[PDB]
Amino acid sequence: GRVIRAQRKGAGSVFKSHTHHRKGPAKFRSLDYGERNGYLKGVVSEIIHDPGRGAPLARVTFRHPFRYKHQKELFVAAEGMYTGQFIYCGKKANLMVGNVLALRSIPEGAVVCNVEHKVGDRGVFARCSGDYAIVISHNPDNGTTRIKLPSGAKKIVPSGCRAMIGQVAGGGRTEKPMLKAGNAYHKYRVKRNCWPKVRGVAMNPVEHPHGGGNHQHIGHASTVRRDAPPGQKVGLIAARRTGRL
Amino acid sequence: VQRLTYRKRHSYATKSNQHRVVKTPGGKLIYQSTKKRASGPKCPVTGKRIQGIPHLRPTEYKRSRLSRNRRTVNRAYGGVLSGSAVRERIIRAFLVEEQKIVKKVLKIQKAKEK
Amino acid sequence: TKIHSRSRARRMKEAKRKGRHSGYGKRKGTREARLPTKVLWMRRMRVLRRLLR
Amino acid sequence: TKRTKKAGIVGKYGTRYGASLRKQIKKMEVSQHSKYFCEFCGKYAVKRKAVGIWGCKDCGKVKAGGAYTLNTASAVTVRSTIRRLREQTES
Amino acid sequence: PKQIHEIKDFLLTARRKDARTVKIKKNKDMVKFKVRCSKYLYTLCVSDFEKADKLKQSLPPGLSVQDL
RNA sequence: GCCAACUCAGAACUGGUACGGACAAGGGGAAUCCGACUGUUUAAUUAAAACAAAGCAUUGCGAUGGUCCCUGCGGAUGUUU
RNA sequence: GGUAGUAGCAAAUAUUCAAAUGAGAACUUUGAAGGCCGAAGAGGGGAAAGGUUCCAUGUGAACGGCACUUGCACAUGGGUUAGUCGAUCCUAAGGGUCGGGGGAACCCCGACAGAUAGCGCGUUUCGCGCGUACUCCGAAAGGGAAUCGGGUUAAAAUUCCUGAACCGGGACGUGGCGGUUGACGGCAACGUUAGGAAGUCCGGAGACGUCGGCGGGGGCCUCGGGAAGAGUUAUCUUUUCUGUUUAACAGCCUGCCCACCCUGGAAACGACUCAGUCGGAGGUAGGGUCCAGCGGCUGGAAGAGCACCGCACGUCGCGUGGUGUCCGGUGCGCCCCCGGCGGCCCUUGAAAAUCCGGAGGACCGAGUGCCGUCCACGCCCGGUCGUACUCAUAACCGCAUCAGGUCUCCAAGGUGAACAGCCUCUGGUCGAUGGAACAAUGUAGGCAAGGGAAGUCGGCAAAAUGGAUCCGUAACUUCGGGAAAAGGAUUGGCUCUGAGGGCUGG
RNA sequence: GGACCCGAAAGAUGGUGAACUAUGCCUGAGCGGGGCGAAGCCAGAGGAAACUCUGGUGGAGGCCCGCAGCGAUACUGACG
Ligand SMILES: [K+]
Ligand SMILES: [K+]
Ligand SMILES: [K+]
Ligand SMILES: [K+]
Ligand SMILES: [K+]
Ligand SMILES: [K+]
Ligand SMILES: [K+]
Ligand SMILES: [K+]
Ligand SMILES: [K+]
Ligand SMILES: [K+]
Ligand SMILES: [K+]
Ligand SMILES: [K+]
Ligand SMILES: [K+]
Ligand SMILES: [K+]
Ligand SMILES: [K+]
Ligand SMILES: [K+]
Ligand SMILES: [K+]
Ligand SMILES: [K+]
Ligand SMILES: [K+]
Ligand SMILES: [K+]
Ligand SMILES: [K+]
Ligand SMILES: [K+]
Ligand SMILES: [K+]
Ligand SMILES: [K+]
Ligand SMILES: [K+]
Ligand SMILES: [K+]
Ligand SMILES: [K+]
Ligand SMILES: [Mg+2]
Ligand SMILES: [Mg+2]
Ligand SMILES: [Mg+2]
Ligand SMILES: [Mg+2]
Ligand SMILES: [Mg+2]
Ligand SMILES: [Mg+2]
Ligand SMILES: [Mg+2]
Ligand SMILES: [Mg+2]
Ligand SMILES: [Mg+2]
Ligand SMILES: [Mg+2]
Ligand SMILES: [Mg+2]
Ligand SMILES: [Mg+2]
Ligand SMILES: [Mg+2]
Ligand SMILES: [Mg+2]
Numbered sequence A: 001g002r003v004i005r006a007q008r009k010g011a012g013s014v015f016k017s018h019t020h021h022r023k024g025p026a027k028f029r030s031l032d033y034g035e036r037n038g039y040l041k042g043v044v045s046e047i048i049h050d051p052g053r054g055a056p057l058a059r060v061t062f063r064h065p066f067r068y069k070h071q072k073e074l075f076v077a078a079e080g081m082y083t084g085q086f087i088y089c090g091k092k093a094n095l096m097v098g099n100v101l102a103l104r105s106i107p108e109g110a111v112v113c114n115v116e117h118k119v120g121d122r123g124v125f126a127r128c129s130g131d132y133a134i135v136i137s138h139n140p141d142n143g144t145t146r147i148k149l150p151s152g153a154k155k156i157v158p159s160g161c162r163a164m165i166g167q168v169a170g171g172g173r174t175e176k177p178m179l180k181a182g183n184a185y186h187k188y189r190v191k192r193n194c195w196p197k198v199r200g201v202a203m204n205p206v207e208h209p210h211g212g213g214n215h216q217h218i219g220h221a222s223t224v225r226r227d228a229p230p231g232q233k234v235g236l237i238a239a240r241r242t243g244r245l
Numbered sequence B: 001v002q003r004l005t006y007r008k009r010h011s012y013a014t015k016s017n018q019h020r021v022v023k024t025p026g027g028k029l030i031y032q033s034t035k036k037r038a039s040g041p042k043c044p045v046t047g048k049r050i051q052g053i054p055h056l057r058p059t060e061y062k063r064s065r066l067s068r069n070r071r072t073v074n075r076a077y078g079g080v081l082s083g084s085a086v087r088e089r090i091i092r093a094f095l096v097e098e099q100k101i102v103k104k105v106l107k108i109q110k111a112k113e114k
Numbered sequence C: 001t002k003i004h005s006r007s008r009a010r011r012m013k014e015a016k017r018k019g020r021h022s023g024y025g026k027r028k029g030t031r032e033a034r035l036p037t038k039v040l041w042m043r044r045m046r047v048l049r050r051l052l053r
Numbered sequence D: 001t002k003r004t005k006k007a008g009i010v011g012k013y014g015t016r017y018g019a020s021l022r023k024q025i026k027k028m029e030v031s032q033h034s035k036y037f038c039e040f041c042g043k044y045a046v047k048r049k050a051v052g053i054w055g056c057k058d059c060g061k062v063k064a065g066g067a068y069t070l071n072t073a074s075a076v077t078v079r080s081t082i083r084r085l086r087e088q089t090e091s
Numbered sequence E: 001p002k003q004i005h006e007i008k009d010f011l012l013t014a015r016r017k018d019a020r021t022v023k024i025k026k027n028k029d030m031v032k033f034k035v036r037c038s039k040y041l042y043t044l045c046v047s048d049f050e051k052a053d054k055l056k057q058s059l060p061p062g063l064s065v066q067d068l
Numbered sequence F: 001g002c003c004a005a006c007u008c009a010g011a012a013c014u015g016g017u018a019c020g021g022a023c024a025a026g027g028g029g030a031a032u033c034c035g036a037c038u039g040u041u042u043a044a045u046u047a048a049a050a051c052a053a054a055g056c057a058u059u060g061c062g063a064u065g066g067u068c069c070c071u072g073c074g075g076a077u078g079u080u081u
Numbered sequence G: 001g002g003u004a005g006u007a008g009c010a011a012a013u014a015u016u017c018a019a020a021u022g023a024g025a026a027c028u029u030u031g032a033a034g035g036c037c038g039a040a041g042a043g044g045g046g047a048a049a050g051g052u053u054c055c056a057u058g059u060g061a062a063c064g065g066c067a068c069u070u071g072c073a074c075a076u077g078g079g080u081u082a083g084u085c086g087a088u089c090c091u092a093a094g095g096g097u098c099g100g101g102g103g104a105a106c107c108c109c110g111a112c113a114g115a116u117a118g119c120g121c122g123u124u125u126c127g128c129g130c131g132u133a134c135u136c137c138g139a140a141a142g143g144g145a146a147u148c149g150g151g152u153u154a155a156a157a158u159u160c161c162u163g164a165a166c167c168g169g170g171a172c173g174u175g176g177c178g179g180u181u182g183a184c185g186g187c188a189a190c191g192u193u194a195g196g197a198a199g200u201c202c203g204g205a206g207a208c209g210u211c212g213g214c215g216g217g218g219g220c221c222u223c224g225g226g227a228a229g230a231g232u233u234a235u236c237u238u239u240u241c242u243g244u245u246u247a248a249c250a251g252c253c254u255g256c257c258c259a260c261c262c263u264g265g266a267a268a269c270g271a272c273u274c275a276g277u278c279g280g281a282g283g284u285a286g287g288g289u290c291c292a293g294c295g296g297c298u299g300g301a302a303g304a305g306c307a308c309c310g311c312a313c314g315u316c317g318c319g320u321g322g323u324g325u326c327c328g329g330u331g332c333g334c335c336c337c338c339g340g341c342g343g344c345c346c347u348u349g350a351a352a353a354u355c356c357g358g359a360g361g362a363c364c365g366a367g368u369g370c371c372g373u374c375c376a377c378g379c380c381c382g383g384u385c386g387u388a389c390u391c392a393u394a395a396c397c398g399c400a401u402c403a404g405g406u407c408u409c410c411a412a413g414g415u416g417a418a419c420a421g422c423c424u425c426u427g428g429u430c431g432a433u434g435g436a437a438c439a440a441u442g443u444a445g446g447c448a449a450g451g452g453a454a455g456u457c458g459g460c461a462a463a464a465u466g467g468a469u470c471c472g473u474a475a476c477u478u479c480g481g482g483a484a485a486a487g488g489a490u491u492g493g494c495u496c497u498g499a500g501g502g503c504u505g506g
Numbered sequence H: 001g002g003a004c005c006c007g008a009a010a011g012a013u014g015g016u017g018a019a020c021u022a023u024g025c026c027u028g029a030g031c032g033g034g035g036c037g038a039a040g041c042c043a044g045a046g047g048a049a050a051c052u053c054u055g056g057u058g059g060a061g062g063c064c065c066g067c068a069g070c071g072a073u074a075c076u077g078a079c080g
């Protein structure tokens, strides 16, 4: 008869993201004439740590195309980039790690990261540490390109979408065991209030479908409907299968 | 062994509530407020301190409070860039311009040949 | 002011400097707590390095 | 004297977390706290600042690398693949 | 407070309009001449008493003089 | 030559064997059950073998999306991938 | 009403003697003695909260669980002084909003559906150029313009008095500085009180976690000598005790640990820290620049404060005079600040106001006066509100003058590893209604011959062990532990011996 | 219909509290003295070599004894 924890997540106010010390969103430059037709040079000024994010971020300074001022940007750092390196963004940029190129100019089999979904969205795919996308094939007829996402899914995107050559830096982070609850506490302290987690069978019936009973047990199949209403949809949602491979 | 009390209505030992113990001509100890330690100007290229400028609070650098010689360095980018950084910038500018001229003349010669 | 003399403390200091009241029955802290070996090592290093210089 | 037979750096954990986990984390503990060769200045002065960030104490260059090593294994393969593709395109 | 190291500068300071009073203090080893101006009190230290007497004689007539 | 500090280690002598003289300050050992451990919990009868935990495994989801809040409009995750 | 003058007044070691006042004194005041708090206090201040409880005089009744001459009660009066301490300013998590979108409507979302506020230059006050939809609230602990001694009240003070400084703003005058129109010096790091400049642009400070070692500074503690006063003196004691001071601010000097510059070119590698580390990307070495200072000297400033010794009025001179305030040592000592390294992170540990600097050079002046000038001196002004007091075993909350609860600053000597326990100095205090007796039963604290868990559901409770030094330490084990395993020996006082250092001088 | 008088556990509607407590966020503050001795580093010994060993230095840990702080196991003590 009580709202369950998963339901209470949506309202927020204690489950909102912790973003006080973050350095701002990481994204490409806004797509403009120079990047659409030629190339624009930038210089990496700093590689910084973004709290709550495994991948490091790189500060890049560009010369504004038509204003007398500096154009400052914050890119997701690709492995191998360094302070003082020159970064080239555009259709005519060379195929080197760190450069941002339109997918039409990236040959098949290349390794890219922070791939745009819509032309000009400034990067949504393959952004986490150690992740990358692979260019599969190009379709000149309809101006679309096929890529392989980190999850293994194959997606078709317009060939005008941009991507950064190389893989995201910071790879191999998750292979290290934490060994203790304190490390997880520190990890999630900067992400959101999602830890520790209480098992549903440890609760009373009033606050979870798994609650209750003189023994700890679910008492009914943990696989639930895709259309099950909130508060009832707990456990393995719309599972096509369960158990080991 | 005289024991002291805060001179102001601040009752917590924060960074801005620092003090020193001074002996007055009256023979008694007393607190006196001391400003927080501040880092002086720093060179963004090398990250090291800028020589010739004292380390004061930002308001202590005001023109009406500090002499001009104390807050200036007689060189291009004086007080902003270190000497080595300025030298590197000058050399880089000169050499890059020279290489630009070399590229232009090479392109002109190649065009003439063809 | 009420009398609180230091004469006994000074006499005890003299006796200690003569080596009195320093036996195993007069020690409560460990040898480390009484005098850390780190302090002795630092002293020896400073002395020997100064002599070498 | 040989202070530990085999523990080495993981001796700080005492008898906690299990032998297998200590052995597994020993590799990361050694690698992330070690010095790495700097290509730019030719010195063994590259130290990890934060996960994925590696700065050189000598020349001051900062590089984005692996979480616990300066260069991940896949980084070299990615560089080789990109070089091959660039050479094919240029040719 | 500021110290004047020359009798000439001391006389120059005493001659200006905003000099209010002059105070003379007799110490064992020297004589101190103090001039009260708008912003600062200027003190001149004279080691020899003969030159101190000459300076006292040389004080402008219109400046008040007090002995300490 | 002039100064300097308290640490350590020995040797005599000596007291009614007292002497960490008050104070201060582990009892120890051989096994069984449970929980790995540190941590947390029923404010005012239960501190535990209960909760959490690192580790292990499963499920949904590539944004025209997964989960969730909202009368509606719109929102949290999301400065995210 | 009976209960009943009954249950009770029992935690926080403790009072005693003489005198004064008073009708009345175990409870008020003075002096003496004996004790306690024992610097992570029963001491000295603040934040919140309270609101006059603060100070003086007086006091019938009530109240202060006995009493009162008394008082945090009652009555009459008095008391809170700021350009410098705060609010005020900035922004944090967030709050409140325009427009727009919803909504029967109270209202909901909140810069997201949009002709933003405005900001600079010259002026016939009009022109030109920039202009991304909140210029609002939000910290008496975050950021931040400026004050210090000395003195003063019954009760206020960094606010009042005296003296001496500083900050912000405004306007001019004098002098100085530049014109090679926009200074000079140094090879350099950089130095000098001055020493062009508009739209535009750029950097820095503000500005940041935690732990460990080391080093510097200020205060405290501590040892010795000189002088001043006091305590002991049957005996000894050149001995015991007290105090022997120097603020903001201005100038000059100095120059920690780093950082930087010049000469030079290194293996027989060297330099170097407690630990590290550094060097042909230029070490060692020699010579320099800069940075901190809560460092030194001087002015302030001895005229002040303190201590001591005198003269005088002797009812009301807040009177008058002298002497001194000196010279050294020491440190894993304690509090605070700073410097520089190192460890830790799948944790990397605010923003803005504000201030400083820089890139560029449109534009700008004269010949005995003009144009500039962040230089020195001179002149004027600085609003509003808070400010008493308590901050707690009676001034807040807990129905109370309740052994509970309530954030924080300072922190002496001895023993001892030690803000452990125990004793002491400054400061505070003897406030817990008193008297007599010492039955049972209780509460709290001990001891007990022989036996040693036979008691009990159960070793509950108590006892035993305990610090430090030396010897020694099993099974098992994830090799990290177990471990202080277990098991043995020693410990006082006195008189000595040995070892472990610094400065100066060829 | 209040229906002789007094009485429910409940139900509905509309408002008020996070000064206690629970959790997230922002900004401040606080935490003796000792024990064990991980990485890194210095030196020496043994050995044909491989390599092994010894003595120092250093100070890691959701490590240990323990003061303050925080909490509350037993006496099933006192009080009740
Ligand atoms: K419900
Ligand atoms: K949580
Ligand atoms: K769980
Ligand atoms: K169940
Ligand atoms: K189960
Ligand atoms: K300067
Ligand atoms: K613990
Ligand atoms: K536990
Ligand atoms: K427990
Ligand atoms: K559990
Ligand atoms: K969504
Ligand atoms: K009376
Ligand atoms: K509307
Ligand atoms: K809005
Ligand atoms: K403030
Ligand atoms: K004053
Ligand atoms: K801050
Ligand atoms: K650090
Ligand atoms: K000051
Ligand atoms: K300029
Ligand atoms: K006041
Ligand atoms: K208060
Ligand atoms: K028994
Ligand atoms: K039994
Ligand atoms: K009826
Ligand atoms: K509260
Ligand atoms: K907090
Ligand atoms: Mg189960
Ligand atoms: Mg000690
Ligand atoms: Mg809807
Ligand atoms: Mg304390
Ligand atoms: Mg009173
Ligand atoms: Mg509207
Ligand atoms: Mg404003
Ligand atoms: Mg530590
Ligand atoms: Mg001492
Ligand atoms: Mg005097
Ligand atoms: Mg210029
Ligand atoms: Mg009330
Ligand atoms: Mg001691
Ligand atoms: Mg609250």
Ligand SMILES: [Mg+2]
Pocket: none
């Ligand atoms: Mg314990």
Ligand SMILES: [Zn+2]
Pocket: D038, D039, D040, D041, D042, D043, D045, D056, D057, D058, D059, D060, D061
């Ligand atoms: Zn390098």
